[PDB]
Write an enzyme that holds these catalytic residues in place. Structure first.
Site, PDB file in Angstrom:
ATOM      1  N   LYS A  55       0.940  -0.927  -0.007  1.00 14.10           N
ATOM      2  CA  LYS A  55      -0.270   0.016  -0.206  1.00 14.10           C
ATOM      3  C   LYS A  55       0.904   1.571   0.535  1.00 14.10           C
ATOM      4  O   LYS A  55       0.443   2.350  -0.789  1.00 14.10           O
ATOM      5  CB  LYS A  55      -0.249   0.405   1.083  1.00 14.10           C
ATOM      6  CG  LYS A  55      -2.111   0.535   1.092  1.00 14.10           C
ATOM      7  CD  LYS A  55      -2.436   1.928   0.643  1.00 14.10           C
ATOM      8  CE  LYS A  55      -4.033   1.834   0.848  1.00 14.10           C
ATOM      9  NZ  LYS A  55      -3.912   3.813   0.609  1.00 14.10           N
ATOM     10  N   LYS A  67      -6.108  -7.959  -2.188  1.00 17.52           N
ATOM     11  CA  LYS A  67      -5.904  -8.713  -3.100  1.00 17.52           C
ATOM     12  C   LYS A  67      -4.465  -9.049  -2.474  1.00 17.52           C
ATOM     13  O   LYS A  67      -4.470 -10.297  -2.427  1.00 17.52           O
ATOM     14  CB  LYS A  67      -5.851  -8.317  -4.608  1.00 17.52           C
ATOM     15  CG  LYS A  67      -7.033  -8.143  -5.058  1.00 17.52           C
ATOM     16  CD  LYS A  67      -7.613  -7.609  -6.860  1.00 17.52           C
ATOM     17  CE  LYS A  67      -8.580  -8.276  -7.390  1.00 17.52           C
ATOM     18  NZ  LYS A  67     -10.070  -7.272  -6.931  1.00 17.52           N
ATOM     19  N   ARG A 144      10.674 -13.691 -29.131  1.00 13.54           N
ATOM     20  CA  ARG A 144      12.158 -11.989 -29.817  1.00 13.54           C
ATOM     21  C   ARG A 144      12.466 -12.564 -30.538  1.00 13.54           C
ATOM     22  O   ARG A 144      13.119 -13.464 -30.867  1.00 13.54           O
ATOM     23  CB  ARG A 144      12.154 -11.910 -27.843  1.00 13.54           C
ATOM     24  CG  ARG A 144      11.207 -12.040 -27.107  1.00 13.54           C
ATOM     25  CD  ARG A 144      11.493 -11.455 -26.116  1.00 13.54           C
ATOM     26  NE  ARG A 144      12.583 -10.429 -25.538  1.00 13.54           N
ATOM     27  CZ  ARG A 144      12.099  -8.674 -25.916  1.00 13.54           C
ATOM     28  NH1 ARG A 144      10.666  -8.846 -26.029  1.00 13.54           N
ATOM     29  NH2 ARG A 144      12.909  -7.422 -25.782  1.00 13.54           N
ATOM     30  N   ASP A 185      10.057  -6.189 -31.355  1.00 14.30           N
ATOM     31  CA  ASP A 185      10.061  -5.710 -33.580  1.00 14.30           C
ATOM     32  C   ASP A 185      11.014  -4.864 -33.635  1.00 14.30           C
ATOM     33  O   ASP A 185      12.249  -4.622 -32.583  1.00 14.30           O
ATOM     34  CB  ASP A 185       8.684  -5.304 -33.343  1.00 14.30           C
ATOM     35  CG  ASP A 185       8.482  -3.564 -32.125  1.00 14.30           C
ATOM     36  OD1 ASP A 185       9.602  -3.454 -32.373  1.00 14.30           O
ATOM     37  OD2 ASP A 185       7.263  -3.594 -32.018  1.00 14.30           O
TER      38      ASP A 185
END
Ligand code: NA
Ligand code: NA
EC number: 2.7.7.7
Length: 330
Positions: A55, A67, A144, A185
């Site tokens: 937090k 969560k 990749r 890319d």
DNA sequence: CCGACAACGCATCAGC
DNA sequence: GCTGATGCGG
DNA sequence: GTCGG
């Protein structure tokens, strides 16, 4: 960066939630909220012991903290467990991995029973050009690109561009320019002195380059192509009796001369660096985006764009010693 | 409480 | 047919 | 979902 073993369970959790928000709930801001929380925790060099601890990190709020407590106490999240096994939602999420298929198209497909790649393969008539190529190279596009292949690719691009017109200036940007060991890319920024912000340029400077790259069989497919931006596929020539190279994504942009270097800077990144630089730029009375760098009046009225002939020029405006792409991780 | 969370090229859709 | 809106991407 | 005016 801290080993994934530290908080990998948490970051993976947040990333999976991120994808569902984006691909299924179509809540892009929640998608980015989770990604930001995942990135902040990913660089946290301490094994998180509670939600309260997390937090404290910027981007982690009450909900994510809650969560984290459930995950730390049970090794899972009930909501995530449920969604994973949901056939409709998992199928929608999955299809978006196909380039050209976004949240909207994935939802439409699943709505009509098209849930897998196999389904897509059997329904080519329901796919646009982009989606067909995305399906064809689904596997290749997720692989990749080692730096060695990126170098070979660059050799070809720089050679063919100069062959078309030696006055062209091409720069391969992205992580590769910063020395990355691998790339997702290839991003090529192209310019020519005949092309400036306020003048024509015989709207074909980009076409000539694409055509040549197709001529030597480097560019294999086209996703989109306009007068300033090309997005397609390429592949290095295979070696004797050797495993043919996978197909790669390559984008090529034509940018006016006077906006070239602002583009190289921007498309070189990293994003974290661009953030820190645009910030440092503001406190100096400057705003830097992809196209230009402009001053700021006593109110904010950013006057005309400042002249840029190189990256360094941009750094000089904001009194920030030019930093080598290699050192632009942040 | 409630708006921001980037701005844009291209392909394609929605509607006149 | 054209104009603007939307989907998608990086 | 998180932040901050
Ligand atoms: Na926080
Ligand atoms: Na996709």
């Amino acid at each position: 960066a801290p080993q994934e073993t530290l908080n990998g369970g948490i970051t993976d959790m947040l990333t999976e939630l991120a994808n569902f928000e984006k691909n299924v709930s179509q809540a892009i801001h929640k998608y980015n909220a989770y990604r930001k929380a995942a990135s902040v925790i990913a660089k946290y060099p301490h094994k998180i012991k509670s939600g309260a601890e997390a937090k404290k990190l910027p981007g982690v709020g009450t909900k994510i903290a809650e969560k984290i407590d459930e995950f730390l106490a049970t090794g899972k999240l009930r909501k995530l467990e449920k969604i994973r096994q949901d056939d409709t939602s998992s199928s929608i999420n999955f299809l978006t991995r196909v380039s050209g298929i976004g949240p909207s198209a994935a939802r439409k497909f699943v709505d009509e029973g098209i849930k897998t790649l196999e389904d897509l393969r059997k329904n080519e008539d329901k796919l646009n050009h982009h989606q067909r190529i995305g399906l064809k190279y689904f596997g290749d596009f997720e692989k990749r690109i080692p730096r060695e292949e990126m170098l070979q690719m660059q050799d070809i691009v720089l050679n063919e561009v100069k062959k078309v017109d030696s006055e062209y200036i091409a720069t391969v940007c992205g992580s590769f320019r910063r020395g990355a060991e691998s790339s997702g890319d290839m991003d090529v920024l192209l310019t020519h002195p005949s092309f400036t912000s306020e003048s024509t340029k015989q709207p074909k400077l980009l076409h000539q380059v694409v055509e040549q790259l197709q001529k030597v069989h480097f560019i294999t497919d086209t996703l989109s192509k306009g007068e300033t931006k090309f997005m397609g596929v390429c592949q290095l020539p295979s070696k004797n009796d050797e495993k043919e190279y996978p197909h790669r994504r390559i984008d090529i942009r034509l940018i006016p001369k006077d906006q070239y270097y602002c583009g190289v800077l921007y498309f070189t990144g990293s994003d974290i660096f661009n953030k820190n630089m645009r910030a440092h730029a503001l406190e100096k009375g400057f705003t830097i985006n992809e196209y230009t760098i402009r001053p700021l009046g006593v109110t904010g009225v950013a006057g005309e764009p400042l002249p840029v002939d190189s990256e360094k020029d941009i750094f000089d405006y904001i009194q920030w010693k030019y930093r080598e792409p290699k050192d632009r991780s942040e």
